[PDB]
């Protein structure tokens, strides 16, 4: 199924991990759907929003 792997960036804002696990879960199902997912915090891509694919927040 590769070649996706469209680019799926998933960003989280989390203090106690609920949102962070949800984010990583999404990135896990993306991998199953051929994407090329990336997981990171929200305020680390501050300004660096992906101008291609899509960004789950």
């Amino acid at each position: 199924e590769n070649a996706h792997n469209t680019p799926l960036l998933v960003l989280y804002g989390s203090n106690m991990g609920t949102a962070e696990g949800t984010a990583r879960d999404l990135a896990d199902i993306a991998m199953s759907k051929g994407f090329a997912p990336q997981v990171a915090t929200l305020d680390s891509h501050a300004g660096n929003l992906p101008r291609e694919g899509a960004v789950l927040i």
């Binding site: 070649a3 996706h4 792997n5 991998m31 090329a36 990336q38």
Partner: protein, 57 residues
């Protein structure tokens, strides 16, 4: 100089001499040569996070 709406990559004299063996590979191709964006798009997935993980070993 880094404003891509005003300036694009040039082949310096140095790079023009190295094209003699680098050709229209990614490094010595002009941005407007068809082979640049095609190779960029084809090869960027080799530097995805999953690819990187798979080079580790």
């Amino acid at each position: 100089a880094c404003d891509e709406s005003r300036f694009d990559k040039n082949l310096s004299q140095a790079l023009k001499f190295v094209r003699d063996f680098f050709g229209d590979g990614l490094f010595t191709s002009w941005t407007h040569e068809k082979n640049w964006k095609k190779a960029h798009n084809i090869l960027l997935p080799s530097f995805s996070q999953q690819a990187m993980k798979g080079y580790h070993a």
